Every structure is written in structure tokens, then in C-alpha cells.
Amino acid sequence: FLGAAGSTMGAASMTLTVQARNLLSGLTVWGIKQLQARVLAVERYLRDQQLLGIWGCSGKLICCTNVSEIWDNMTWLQWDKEISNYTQIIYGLLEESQNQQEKNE
Amino acid sequence: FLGAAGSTMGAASMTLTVQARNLLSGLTVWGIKQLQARVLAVERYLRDQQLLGIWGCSGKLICCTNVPWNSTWSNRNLSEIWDNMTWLQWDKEISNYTQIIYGLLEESQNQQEKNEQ
Amino acid sequence: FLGAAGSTMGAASMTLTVQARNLLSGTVWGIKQLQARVLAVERYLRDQQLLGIWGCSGKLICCTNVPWNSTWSNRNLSEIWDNMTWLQWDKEISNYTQIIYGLLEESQNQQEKNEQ
Amino acid sequence: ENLWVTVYYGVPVWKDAETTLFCASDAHNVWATHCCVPTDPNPQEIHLENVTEEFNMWKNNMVEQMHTDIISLWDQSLKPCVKLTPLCVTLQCTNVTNNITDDMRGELKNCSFNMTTELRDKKQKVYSLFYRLDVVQINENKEYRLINCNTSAITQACPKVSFEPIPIHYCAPAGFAILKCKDKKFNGTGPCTNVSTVQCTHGIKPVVSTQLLLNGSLAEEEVIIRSENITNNAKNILVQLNESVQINCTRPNNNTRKSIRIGPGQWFYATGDIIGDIRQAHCNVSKATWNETLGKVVKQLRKHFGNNTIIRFANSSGGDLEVTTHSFNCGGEFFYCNTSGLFNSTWISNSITLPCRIKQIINMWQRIGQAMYAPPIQGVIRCVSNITGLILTRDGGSTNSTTETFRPGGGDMRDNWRSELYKYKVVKIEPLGVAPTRCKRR
Amino acid sequence: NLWVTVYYGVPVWKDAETTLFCASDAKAYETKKHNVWATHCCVPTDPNPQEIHLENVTEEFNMWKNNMVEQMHTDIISLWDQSLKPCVKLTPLCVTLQCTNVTNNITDDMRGELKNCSFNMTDKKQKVYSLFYRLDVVQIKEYRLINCNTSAITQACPKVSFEPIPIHYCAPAGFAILKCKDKKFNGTGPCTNVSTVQCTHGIKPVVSTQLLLNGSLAEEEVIIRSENITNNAKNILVQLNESVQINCTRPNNNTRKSIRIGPGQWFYATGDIIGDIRQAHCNVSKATWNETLGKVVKQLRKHFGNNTIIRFANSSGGDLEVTTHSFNCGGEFFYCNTSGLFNSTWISNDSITLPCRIKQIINMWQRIGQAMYAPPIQGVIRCVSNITGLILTRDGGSTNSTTETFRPGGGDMRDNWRSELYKYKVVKIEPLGVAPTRCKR
Amino acid sequence: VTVYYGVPVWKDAETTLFCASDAHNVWATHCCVPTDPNPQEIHLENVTEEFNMWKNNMVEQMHTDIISLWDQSLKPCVKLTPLCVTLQCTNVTNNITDDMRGELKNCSFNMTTELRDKKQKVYSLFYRLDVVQINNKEYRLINCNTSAITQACPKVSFEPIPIHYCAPAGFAILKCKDKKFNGTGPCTNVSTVQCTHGIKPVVSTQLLLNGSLAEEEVIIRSENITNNAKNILVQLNESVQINCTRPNNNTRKSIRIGPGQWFYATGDIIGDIRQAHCNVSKATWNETLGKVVKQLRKHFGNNTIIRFANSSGGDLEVTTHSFNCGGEFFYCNTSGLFNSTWISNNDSITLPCRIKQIINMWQRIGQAMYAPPIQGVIRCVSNITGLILTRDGGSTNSTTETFRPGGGDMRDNWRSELYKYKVVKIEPLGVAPTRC
């Protein structure tokens, strides 16, 4: 599952199908809290799909976009923390690029 | 958002796709009503996507298809329903038999798939 | 809906839309209904994600780059697409479902990484 | 070879499954507590040609779920009601003798007692009538207590709740389906060769009774006898009749209701004085229909016990009234009728009046941590019901020269709800699968 | 040679009845720490209540069939009742009370108004005493509390505030709220200046009768609105053009007497009064009221004739909840007379003082199976409120006359919300269009 | 900037975990989800993760859940308000040993019965700790008229079972397998799991009973070791067995207190009356401290003298070792264990115990449970798995450190097992620069 977390950014790209499937596949009064938890889990799933939708990456695990070269000595949980402060800019740019791509329709 | 009633223009449908960003933008007593509302918002989203999928229009805003237009539905030619009529008015004109058009769209996509697979 | 259940495998292929239409939709009672709606969504999404992983999103029928292994079944196409139904087929290859599915996920993973 | 995997979504396959079913019904009843779901005007069956499927009325899922839902509704309806805990006081009880017929001489008591008032510093003296089944001696002397004052709190059932059965249709959500068996004699278990798919059940009235099943479905053409391991005495026998038998029941006394305020917004409904003379409650079964009906059951029954023997009917075994008598709920009144007048016969391989007892303190789900008080009804009661089946048991033993004695049985409510829901099963639709074809590339 | 084409993102909507969510701004729950409104309507809103103008859209509105009103009414009741569930039940107080009159430094306007009651409170008994207002105590010099024979009295919890804060109702995704911007809109029919919003402007859930306090004002003129102005069974809601300031007080400096009635179960009784005992009252500017009422008449004559005499009169008999200005000031419950406000005939030194009664056992929302006890408030109460609208009714029988009579009245509560939600409508968005008709694949 | 989905990353997060258990018990009727008969764990090669057991929200959740279940379980039970009456006691002198003189009293009282217009006179025994003399000898219960005292239901068991906490979808629990991890800082050899191990919700004070043992020497964990305001949690390598008993053959009288309510009174003791007690092997205890002392010297100096002493003060909940054995509540004197000075250079220890019935559970003032009596002789055996210690405020003006037993806050007991676990939220969506 998360076994590739400590390897390298490149190699970990080969386990994307494992992680994607495992996040969706998984008396009653106090239990309302569990019902709320189930609904929230569904919304989290859809939130990611909805971002892929507006960015034009729907249905993909590896999406090519329109917006040094290491990928060996750095891993996920390192590199992605370093760009935490830049990431929101990127997300805005990904949406903007798709908004312009949509002109051709 | 609902920025126009400027006839059935259709040139700016991208604006209302913000309702497809509906989840991105997001003691229990009456919290049940609020929970029901969250569930229904999800179902409405999924039902529209399922329907576009089954018809072969998924991923697009403007889907040009294989079902011919019938005179038994509306016979106003084109300028009447493009330059002079609004979307609210158009929906009223074809308010009836939408289940007919939808059923035909599903049949058409099934034929398109069997002819390829 | 399930009217095609007794028909042959190649006949039932014409009712895929019919069934897809009703898989999502079609104070004790209140809580049961809410729980039922949540379940319907969860099951629906699990099946759709799986088609997405396999690269079959948006299609009722898709072909993939996975050869049929000769050990999964030993029957002719004239005997598979006719002369039996899907209920029978599902039982006959039941013990390989998770194998085939794993292969489908891997085949698409390779197809996708190959595109950069 | 050259065959390739092709994936199909929307495939007509399924597996047995347990899911949540929801209520639907047609146009203050406890059986429709926000059951705001219409049934179809046409709950159209989809016949499945060439489909044979296995059914099992025993070890089903629908029966247990129905049982659970009924108890839950029952309790939910009683929660917001007046507690009668303050009435567990010593009663001063004497005999009701004025215009009482012989059959009723000792049946009713006239009890006076101290009761609470709106204010904490005030008390009132009141009286009411009770059936002897609800009142017992404290030690020996007119000092009595209610039967459940050493067991549990008694909750008064709320007025304006009828509890009258409404056929309830159980519906499966989304990807689930209910399959129905259309055979006439499927006999409880095994393959059914004539089946159909439905979205909701036919509508089952939650009638609560013992020994005899009232207002259910009839068998088509012939009597059907269903039992798990029928050549045993371990399991009961369910007999579904192919014709109904009417049973005419009554509470002939013109009873009244005495409304007593017991606190700041709380009322107790007491049995008041009776207008006119007092007679015994009873049920009438016509001999003209019962003897023939029973003979038909025997003919069908004598398949499993050899085709050459004597079938006898006898009364129930000892135990609580909830199991030894026939329980009815008519107008909200609770009857416990003596069926030994019906089950008394010898069958050789060649008007019946049943007295009834009445109770106000009820424990119907075989639980004693709860109890309900049934308010009196200000009027005279008559009801006519359809006997659509029986729950019977048989004596055990061996070396009795194949002598078979049958007796009324049941009392376990889950078995009443097998007289319906025997033809239905729930399956999960699993619309995704693979098959080989001539499609070499994606 | 025309073909079906499918469009997603079509600007089409339908009338709808849905569940709106309740929201408040980001400061409301930081300042109003124990306020039920801020606590439960916790979703932050109003960063920018941006409107989308709908060019060329005519939309039909109906304030008397508006589901938003019914939802608000239910939400207010539900929250109120939930808030009292864990509070102390004052059942030890349903004992005979022995009472005498408070005659200590009392004015002439309150003789017999306050009573000093004592009783034996719950193997042990403790004689206790407290002060009560006349309205809460009924003779049976033996007395009992009102609402002691039909219902239980629940003490409101002193730790939770019900002080109104603005409430915004917000559409769930898939829905939108349309606003009528036409000025001088009378609550019904087509509106041509229309815009779309995510949430309402913020309504304070103020509860009052006869005079509506702290609402919004009309932009240009007094607006008279009714379901059927020619009927007599309907109320007339008058939205004022300018506010009228009303200054209310409970001049008596009260103390609190804490009595323990169980294991952490405390009862709060009125202790005694410091200083002179005086009558509670409200003041309005006389000149302002006169001009305000004249404006109401000018815009009322339009429906009755400009040669028709309009007179105002006070309320009919009935319970205080409908005959007086039911009002909450400082958390105390007031019932002000108002007959000094509605006493004139209109033909084509500077203030008015309204005496007020105080009551502690309150039966809210016109229900009778429940009662609430309001704990005493210490010190002296003063508040200033804005009269933003009136609720008037009209006497029938005017057929045989040239004069119409208007009286204050109405206590249904929904009307207090219809007066703010009248410009809003909820619609469902239907983004999928099926066949405008254009091309083959 | 390529978009990837299914990326193995996460961030620390606070969520609600659900309870699961292996297959009338308070946790069994809650932790309804069966556990995996064969749980899996995934080793994460080359993953370093920062852990902090003192900031672990899993502990805060467990604390809240344990209290909530306890309180919910006691709701549908008998209130003992009707029993707050003057009681009339006589000292029990019936073949009582010296150490039990004055411990038991026999009171008569007038209580409720089946009917509200009748009363009954009953007699029962009370432990002195539950009864206060009012100045024949008149008595009332402790906090008789100020606390809400609820009878525990005879039908519910509070025996701890090894409950597991499991992640909801979207979350994972990480484990620190480093054998010497001291509760804070980076940990290598991190594994991903779906559920925690089974943790028995054992309630105790000075000594931590049952649960896990350290594999490599004694491990001492604290938030701030030089700060005397903090407790020191010491994990042992081998357990110390304790044999505890309530030797008196007591009986139980079930009497009616209301229409459908039963009250359980302590009845005449059948056998002779003796003091309750716990047995600790003497040699084992002495070896155990020697191991603890060596590890303490590593923090306080190898030329520093280590001394053990009893509690400095407080009420029973902190001055004694408390525990529950089969429903009975013990308060044991540990001064017999913590009495030695350690110099750098067949017997047993008996700890006398007191029994108390009205329990101020979770240290809440005004809320108490009445523990019904249990008939017969009660025995239990337990494992000391760890100690809670504190140090005296002697500053630096000493060559000797003095350690005393701690106790009180329950969060520290639960931290003894939930120290290797961390909860993280999985965030599968991310981006990276690629040549496409």
C-alpha cells in the first residue's frame, strides 16, 4: 500500500493503482457519527475527482498538463513538503490552463 | 453565475459548471436534515454524470449526437429557437417528452458501442 | 431490468444500459432511507473507480490488452456467447475474478506509463 | 487461441445478500411513522424466463429484519407516553357482583386506591375496575397490587394511536432486488422454476396473533404444509390454508372510560362502570367450515406420517397465556381465547364457542423489562377475522404405533412473519464481469 | 436535417422546496461565545454577499407561500426546544404557596403587583421565600403557580444566550436564491429587477408581537403588504421607511436568590429589590411616532380611498401575548400596553410613555403543553430598539361606513419572518439541456 | 507540472478512530466490528517519521470514549437518592481480626419497596470509607445529599477486553518499531497498520497492570525529565506477578428498592473477617527496582543515589494503588514496595488493601457509582508492566533523588500503550515537473 513511501519519487509512480483502489474500497443512535463519517469519506473521494475534472485529468493516474531533475534522491513526503507553500499557485494555474483549453469546443 | 437570459445563446455554458465544483467548495439533532442535504447534493452530481456517461457525452459541455430532431417535439425551425427564444422558454417548449429524447439517446449510444466492440 | 437474466451471454449484452440506469437510483424509516442512499452511492463509486483504474471509464463495454488465459476456462466462443447465460458464466470462472482484475489493473498501469 | 479479455458493465447477475429494506405504503398509526414513500400504482413484476433459483423461507434475512423493525416501532411509539409508575400502590379490591352472569362471577374486581394529584402536597382517592388477570394479592384481606408492580414500569399506551395493521411493502434500494417465487407449491425450500423480479413486496399486514394466523394470504388450490425437518417435533409446522375460515369475536359488555388526571399534563385512563349486564367475551367458529377445513389439513398432513394412520388433535401444553391461548388484538382490546374447542378430534384413515379472557397489562414481545397498559375502550367490541393458517406442533416419542397427536403451537412472532416473506429473497446485483472475445487490442 | 445536441451548463431553473443551511459571519462565534445562534449556525459566511444581476429576467414571487419562512419557523422552534432539554425542571415548586403583598417603598402604579411568597420545599422540608410577579401566581392567601396543573415548568439555562444575531440562510449546491430588487414590491406577482445570491442578507430572529423590532427598512416609502387587502382575516404588514426609536427599561434593581433543589440542580429566585419599586415602561418620541403614523396612513389610503377616514384603535381582548407588545429586553420578558400609540382619527411633553408588565413563566410559540421559567436578571435593565414595521389588522363591517379601523395585532410569528424573507425565492438549478437542435456528430 | 493520483504521502491528522474487537461486557457491546483474524502490517523501508506520545490525539480519544461508555452504561440503572436517610450503625465485632476493627459497620434503615405507600426496614453492612458519622450513632453516606449516586447495573461487566482502534478510510496508523524509542523524535523502522494492537482498558493508579513489556532493558519515558511536574512512565521487561484477594466469604442480599428495581446490599459475612490484601514476590520486586535504578542513573548520574518512597499525600485515588478485580474496588497500600535506597557500590511483600463501594469515578466531583457487592471469595492475578513515578522538588541541592509513585490522570495510563502509534491522513493527489 504505502510501501513505496520511502523509496524514490520515480519508482513510487508504479504503485499508483494500489493506493487509488485502497482509498475507496475501505444500536444506531450514537452511530449517526459513523453515518456522517461515511458521507464525509465519499465527499473526500469526489473532491479529488472533481479537481481532476476541472483540471482536465479525469480518468487518469498520470496526467500531462500545459503550464533540478532529480526524481532519485528525493522521495514523496520530502519533495511535496518543500513545495507546500507553492502548491496553491500550481492548483490555480492548472485550472486556468484548462479554462483556456476549453476554448477549443 | 446565471448571467444571462440573452436568448438561447449557449456560448457561455462554462460559467454554470461551477455547480460541478460543488463539493470542492465545501450534538446532532436537526443535523440529520443537513446530512440529508449533503447526501442529496452528492446524488444529484452523480446522476448527471451517469446520464452524460450512458449517452456518450461525458467530459464535454457541448455533445453533438446521433438522434435526429422530430417535428412531433417542436417545429419552430431554427431562428425562432436560437436568436429569439431564451433557455427558460425553450425548456418550457420541450418540457414534455424529455424522457423520450433521453431514452433515444441511450439507445443510440448502445448501438455505437456494439458496432465498435 | 433483469428480464435478460435467462437469456444467453451475447443476448444480454443489449440490456447493459437498462441495468446501468437503475444501479444508482430507482423516524426509524427515515434513518433507514438515509443509510440506504449512502450505501447506494458507495457501491456505485467502487465499481466506477475500478473501471477508471482499468481505463474503461465511461463505457459499458471495453476491450483491454489482456489475453484470455487458457486455464481460466475451456470452452468455445460458440459455447460461451451462446448456449449459456451470465449467471452460469459468473459461477464457472468465479475463482479467477481477483486474478483477472489484478491483471487488468496492471495492464492499464503499463499502458498509461508508456504514454509519459 | 487469440482470445482477449473484454469487460462488461451492466451484466444481469446476482448473489444472495442481506441489506436494509425500507417502508412504502398506499393512502397517527404506528405502522406508518413517517413512511412517506408511495408504492407504485403498478409494482410491475418482471418475469424471468428460463431462470430457476433457490429459495429458503427459513434462515432468511427478511424475517428477522421485519421482526426487528416491528419491535423498534412499537417501542418508539410508547416512549412519549404517560408512565403509570405512580399507580403501584396498595389497592383495596372487592368482587363485582351487580348483574354478573355465572361465567363472570369472579372475573372483575372493583379497586379503590390513593393516587397522586397535580400538586405535590395533595392526594386524591379514586376507584377503577380491573380484570383479575392484572391484579394479584400482596400477601393474602383486600390488599392487592398490579401484576407487574414487582417486575417493571408500566407505560400507558398513548390515546389516538390505533395500532391497526396497514399492509407494509418492503422495498430494496438501488443495486438490490427482490426476487419472488411464483410457484404454487414450492414447499419452503429448494429451486423455484417460475420466478420474477420486483422492487417491493406485496404488502404485509403486521397482524400479531398466536396459534391461529389471521388475515394473511391463502394457498392456491390446495393446503400447503411447511416445516423445517418435518419428520421431527423440534420445529413447528406451518399450515397455509387454501380457503379462509371466519372467526367472530366479541367483548359484549358496554364498558366505559374514566379519565383521571394524575399529574401536570398526565392522565390515566381507568376502566369505569359498565352499563348494562355483564357477560363473558368469546369467539365463534362455524362447525360447518372448521370440520371440513381440518379434514383437508389432515389429508395433506398424512403424507409425512405414513399414508395409513390416525391423526389426532389435542389442546395446548401448559405455559403462559401468550403461548397457551389464541391472542387477538381487536379495536385495541387484548383477548386470550381457549382453542381446546377446536383442536379436539380423531381422524381415521377411511358453531364452536371459545370462551375468552381479557387483559390490560401486556408483555407481547416476550420481554419483561417493559410493559404496556392498554386503556379501556368506551364501547362494545365485535370483530370478524379470516383464519388463513395454523401453527401446529406434535408430540414426541417413538414406540407409539405411529400415533400422531397435533397441538396448537407458536407464540414466537418470527414464525408469523414466515407466512408471508416465504416467497421472497433479496439479492445483490453485481453488474460487472468479464468474458473472452475476438478483440485483440484496447 | 436537424439533430439533437446535448448541453451541460444551461441557465435554467425551477421553483423548489429544499433544506437551506444556516450560516453566520466569522466574528459572531468568537464574540457571542455561548449564543445558540452563533453556536449552531456555525458555518462562516458573508465574505462578500455578491449578487449576480439577471438581465432581462422576470420572476414571479409570493411571500405568503414561501417555504423559506416555514423552514425558518421550524428551525427557530427546534433549536429553542433542544436548548431547554438539559435544563432544570422546576417541579418542586408545585406546592401550595402562602403569599403576602410587597408594600415596601412601592409606587401607586404597582400596588398588588408583586407578591412575597413562601413555601415548604423538598425526609426534610425547608421553608423558603421569593418574590413573584402577579401574572405568574394564581389564587387557590393560598396561591399556586400558573402552568403547574397542565405542564411542567423548565427553568431556562443561564449559561446559554438567545440574543438574536444575524442569520443567513444559504443555498446548498444545486440551488440558488433569487432576490427581488424592485423597490416598492408588495410581496407578490412578477418582479423585473432580479438578481441571484448564495445567501440571504442576515436576519435577526427577534421575537415580538404588534411592533416589529430591529428589521430592515423600506428604501423609499412605507410599504403595505397583505395576502388579500380586501379581506379581514389577513394581517397587514407595514414596512416602515424610517425607524422609530423605542427606549425600554425595568428600573427596579433586583437581586438573585440561589436555591439548591438537587445534586447540582439550582433554582434561581427573585431575592429582593434594592431601592424604590417602580413600573417598567417604554418611551417613543411623540413627534416621530406622529409623523410615522401619518406616513402609514398616506400609503394606506391608496387601497381604501382618499376620502375615507382612517382611524387607529388599540387591541381586542385576549391573552397578553396578542393584546400587548410582547417583547424581550435584556433577557427579561415584557408585555407593553401600546394603547397610547394607536389612538387617533385621520381626516384628509415630547414623548409617549407606555407602561409594561413583566412575566416570568412564559408559554412560547403559542403552545400550551410546555412552559419556561425565566431566571431573574440582577441589576437594572435598559435597552434601545428600532421599530421597523407594524402588524395591523382591519375591522370588518365597514361596508356601512366611510371609516375604516385599524388595530395592532397578530401573534402567529411567521409574519415576523415573512417581513424579512419576502424578497427571496429558492430555485433548483437544472443544468442539463437536451435538444436545442443543431448538428449530426 | 504533471498531476499524479495515488501518491504515497500523508499529513498528521486528528480524526475519529473506530473501536473493533476479537470474537453483556461494556466494550463488547460497543466494539461490534470484528477484527481481522490475520491482521497485516506493511514495513516502510527508509521512512523516518516524527512521533510524540505526549501530543497523541489517540489517547485523548480513548480517554473520552472510555468515560462516555462508562456513563452511558450507568444511565438505565437505579438512583440511590431514596437511600439518603439517617442510618443507625453498630460496630461489627463478630470474629473480626485486629486489622479489621472498625472497618465494618451494621446499619438499620427505612427504605422504599415495591409499592410507593409501603416502607421496609432493612439491615446492611457498609465499609467505613462510605459512611460518615453525624454529631446511638447516626450515619449518612459520604456526600449523601450533594452527589448524584447511581447504582451500577448487575448485568454489565466492566472487565477489560483487548479492544483495537482502527482507521477509517482515507487514514492510516503508523507504528514505531524502534525497540528503544523514548516517546519523542524521529523513528526509523516505521510500519503501516490498519488497527492498533489490542489494548486492554485497565484502570489503575500507581502501578500499571497488564499490557506490554519492553524487549530491551527498562525504558523510561517522560515529556521533560528534569521537570518535576511531569510523570515518568517506566516500562518493565518482565512482569511482576501480583496475587490479590478479598478473603472474606461475603454474601449478597438482593432486595427490592422499587417496582422493577433491585438494590444489592452486603449481607452477613459467612466466614471469618480478614483484611483484603495483595502479594508481591520479594525477590522479583527487588530485581525489578535494580533494573529501574540503573536506567534512572543514566538520566540522573552514575554517582547519584536513588531512593524510593511512598506517596507524598492526596486522597485514595492517588495515595493507594487502586484497581478493579471482578467488579470489586481495591485501594492497596504500596508503602511496602516503595521503601529502599539504592547505592551505586522465598519471601513476599504483603500489601494491605481497603475496599470501598461509592466510587468517584474519573475524579468527577458530584458523580459517583455505587458498586454492588459480590458474594464469595474474590481472587485475581495481575502483571505489573510499568510504573508511574515522580521526583521530589529538591532542586540540585542533593546527591540523592527520591522517587514516589504517581497516579491520578488516566490519560497517562493509556499513553503507556499508545506511544508507538501515529494517525495520518492520506493525500493521494499531488504534482511534479516531468518532461511532458
Ligand SMILES: *[C@@H]1O[C@H](CO)[C@@H](O[C@@H]2O[C@H](CO)[C@@H](O[C@@H]3O[C@H](CO)[C@@H](O)[C@H](O[C@H]4O[C@H](CO)[C@@H](O)[C@H](O)[C@@H]4O)[C@@H]3O)[C@H](O)[C@H]2NC(C)=O)[C@H](O)[C@H]1NC(C)=O
Ligand atoms: C490482568 O489479567 C488477568 C488475566 O490474565 C485478570 O484476571 C482475571 O479476571 C477475571 C475477571 O475478574 C477472572 O474470571 C472470573 O473467575 C471467577 C471464578 O469463580 C468467575 O466466577 C467469574 O465469572 C463471572 O461471570 C460469569 C458470566 O456467566 C457469572 O456467571 C459469574 O457469576 C461471575 O460474575 C470470572 O470467570 C479470572 O479468573 C482472572 N484470572 C486469574 C488468573 O485469576 C486481571 O483482572 C487483569 N488485571 C486487572 C487490573 O484487571
Ligand SMILES: *[C@@H]1O[C@H](CO)[C@@H](O[C@@H]2O[C@H](CO)[C@@H](O[C@@H]3O[C@H](CO)[C@@H](O)[C@H](O)[C@@H]3O)[C@H](O)[C@H]2NC(C)=O)[C@H](O)[C@H]1NC(C)=O
Ligand atoms: C435591537 O438591537 C440593540 C442593539 O443594537 C439591542 O440592545 C442591546 O442588547 C444587549 C443585550 O441585551 C446589551 O448588552 C449589555 O451591555 C452591557 C454594557 O454595560 C453589559 O453590562 C450587559 O451584560 C450586556 O452585555 C446592549 O448594551 C444593548 N444595546 C444598547 C444600545 O442598549 C436590543 O435589545 C435589540 N432589540 C430587541 C427587541 O432584540
Ligand SMILES: *[C@@H]1O[C@H](CO)[C@@H](O[C@@H]2O[C@H](CO)[C@@H](O)[C@H](O)[C@H]2NC(C)=O)[C@H](O)[C@H]1NC(C)=O
Ligand atoms: C382482519 O380484518 C378485519 C377487516 O378489516 C378487521 O376487523 C375490522 O376492524 C375495523 C377497525 O376500525 C372495524 O371498524 C371493522 O368493523 C372490523 N370488521 C368487522 C367485521 O367488524 C379485523 O380486526 C382483522 N383481524 C385482526 C386480528 O386484526
Ligand SMILES: *[C@@H]1O[C@H](CO)[C@@H](O[C@@H]2O[C@H](CO)[C@@H](O)[C@H](O)[C@H]2NC(C)=O)[C@H](O)[C@H]1NC(C)=O
Ligand atoms: C418576604 O417574607 C420573608 C418571610 O417569609 C421576610 O423575611 C424576614 O425579614 C425580617 C426583617 O426584619 C428578618 O428579621 C427575618 O429573619 C426574615 N425571615 C426569613 C425567613 O429570612 C422578607 O423580608 C419579606 N420580603 C419582602 C420584600 O417583603
Ligand SMILES: *[C@@H]1O[C@H](CO)[C@@H](O[C@@H]2O[C@H](CO)[C@@H](O)[C@H](O)[C@H]2NC(C)=O)[C@H](O)[C@H]1NC(C)=O
Ligand atoms: C420616559 O420619559 C419620562 C418622562 O416623561 C422619564 O422620567 C423622568 O426621568 C428623570 C430623570 O432625571 C426624572 O428627573 C423625572 O422626574 C422623570 N419624570 C417622570 C414623569 O417620572 C423616563 O426616565 C423615560 N424612560 C426611559 C426608558 O427613558
Ligand SMILES: *[C@@H]1O[C@H](CO)[C@@H](O)[C@H](O)[C@H]1NC(C)=O
Ligand atoms: C534505502 O537506502 C539504501 C542506501 O544504500 C539503498 O540502497 C536502498 O535501495 C534504499 N531503499 C529503498 C526502498 O529505496
Ligand SMILES: *[C@@H]1O[C@H](CO)[C@@H](O)[C@H](O)[C@H]1NC(C)=O
Ligand atoms: C404537456 O402536456 C399538457 C397536457 O395537458 C399540455 O397542456 C402542455 O401544453 C404540454 N407541454 C408541452 C411542452 O408540449
Ligand SMILES: *[C@@H]1O[C@H](CO)[C@@H](O)[C@H](O)[C@H]1NC(C)=O
Ligand atoms: C428462453 O428460452 C427460449 C428457448 O427455449 C428462448 O426463445 C427465449 O428467448 C428465452 N428467454 C429469454 C429471456 O432469453
Ligand SMILES: *[C@@H]1O[C@H](CO)[C@@H](O)[C@H](O)[C@H]1NC(C)=O
Ligand atoms: C370473591 O372473591 C374471591 C377471591 O378468591 C372468589 O373466590 C369469590 O368467588 C368471590 N365472590 C363472588 C363473586 O361472589
Ligand SMILES: *[C@@H]1O[C@H](CO)[C@@H](O)[C@H](O)[C@H]1NC(C)=O
Ligand atoms: C419439502 O419440505 C421438507 C421439509 O422437511 C423437505 O425435507 C423436502 O425435501 C421438501 N421437498 C422438496 C421437493 O424440496
Ligand SMILES: *[C@@H]1O[C@H](CO)[C@@H](O)[C@H](O)[C@H]1NC(C)=O
Ligand atoms: C355465538 O353463538 C351464540 C349462540 O347462542 C350467540 O348468542 C352469540 O352472539 C355468538 N357470538 C358471536 C361472536 O358471534
Ligand SMILES: *[C@@H]1O[C@H](CO)[C@@H](O)[C@H](O)[C@H]1NC(C)=O
Ligand atoms: C360472522 O358474522 C357474519 C355476518 O356479519 C355471518 O354471516 C357469519 O356466519 C358469522 N360467522 C360465524 C362463525 O358465526
Ligand SMILES: *[C@@H]1O[C@H](CO)[C@@H](O)[C@H](O)[C@H]1NC(C)=O
Ligand atoms: C394586595 O393589594 C390589592 C389592592 O387592590 C388587594 O386587592 C389584594 O387583596 C392584596 N393581596 C394580598 C395578598 O395582600
Ligand SMILES: *[C@@H]1O[C@H](CO)[C@@H](O)[C@H](O)[C@H]1NC(C)=O
Ligand atoms: C409547612 O408545613 C407546616 C406543617 O404543620 C405548616 O404548618 C406550614 O404552614 C407550612 N409552611 C408553608 C409556607 O406552607
Ligand SMILES: *[C@@H]1O[C@H](CO)[C@@H](O)[C@H](O)[C@H]1NC(C)=O
Ligand atoms: C422616506 O424618507 C425620506 C427621507 O429619508 C423622505 O423624503 C420621504 O418623503 C419618505 N417617504 C414617505 C412615504 O414619506
Ligand SMILES: *[C@@H]1O[C@H](CO)[C@@H](O)[C@H](O)[C@H]1NC(C)=O
Ligand atoms: C434613547 O436614549 C438616547 C441616549 O442613549 C437618547 O438620545 C434618545 O433621545 C432616547 N430616545 C427616546 C425615544 O427617548
